[PDB]
């Protein structure tokens, strides 16, 4: 199964509003069937695309619609390997 091995923004981490989110996987994701849930302190954030640009597919390109607003993100998320496995987690980041 897809283990989430590291994320940026980092769980927890600060930063400056990223471009978007990068996910990295101990496996192939597909873009397709993975869903990610993006919400700033408990209301949904507007995800614009998933993409995964590797030809492994281990990282995720997560694109918010806008820029992010400083504050408190939580990421849910529920990956399908490219052997057709459900994982699923969250965490956590602030800007
Ligand atoms: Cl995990
Ligand atoms: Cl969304
Ligand atoms: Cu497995
Ligand atoms: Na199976």
Redesign the pocket.
């Known amino acids: 199964?897809?283990h989430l091995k590291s994320a940026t923004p980092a769980a927890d981490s600060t930063v400056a509003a990223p471009a978007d989110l990068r996910l990295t996987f101990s496996?192939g994701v597909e873009a397709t069937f993975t869903k990610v849930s993006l919400s700033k302190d408990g209301t949904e954030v507007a995800i614009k695309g998933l993409e995964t640009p590797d030809a492994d597919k281990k990282t995720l390109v997560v694109t918010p619609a806008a820029p992010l607003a400083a504050g408190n993100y939580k990421v849910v998320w529920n990956a399908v390997?490219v052997?057709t496995?459900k994982?699923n987690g969250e965490y956590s980041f602030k800007v």
Do not use: D, R, V, W
């Open positions: 199964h897809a496996e390997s052997a496995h994982s």
